[PDB]
């Protein structure tokens, strides 16, 4: 047998919370634009290794991250700094390139989403 790990933590009740213009942009513009993209659906929740029959996924990926987690974290004010959120997006993309062979469909989807992510981050407000 093999099991899914628990999904990443999405609330830190002991961490101070704030809403900033940049965090609002990350949620309402960056995450929203990627979420609605045609290639987003594999990235909208944690990789379900059981239902996808990938017993090696969490043997290889020890820092999983996904856009559903990022959305919940933003909604919970989990991030104090915009850079913490950006790091989670970066982790999500790099995990995909670690696990999957170059040229696989999922990798081309990640590369397209990453390009859009960088385009959105180019216009991060003050």
């Amino acid at each position: 047998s093999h099991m899914n790990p628990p999904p990443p933590e999405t609330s830190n009740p002991n961490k101070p919370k704030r809403q900033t213009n940049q965090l609002q942009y990350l949620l309402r513009v960056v995450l929203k634009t990627l979420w609605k993209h045609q290639f987003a659906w594999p990235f909208q929740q944690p990789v379900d290794a059981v239902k996808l029959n990938l017993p090696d996924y969490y043997k290889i990926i020890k820092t999983p991250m996904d856009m559903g987690t990022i959305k919940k974290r933003l909604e919970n004010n989990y991030y104090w700094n915009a850079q913490e959120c950006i790091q989670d997006f970066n982790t999500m993309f790099t995990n995909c390139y670690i696990y999957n062979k170059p040229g696989d469909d999922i990798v081309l989807m990640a590369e397209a989403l990453e390009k859009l992510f960088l385009q959105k981050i180019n216009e991060l407000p003050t």
């Binding site: 290889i60 670690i98 999957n100 062979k101 469909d105 999922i106 989807m109």
Partner: peptide
């Protein structure tokens, strides 16, 4: 490094 996930409609 992994088994991979096959086709995704591309």
């Amino acid at each position: 490094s992994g088994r991979g996930x096959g086709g995704x409609g591309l």
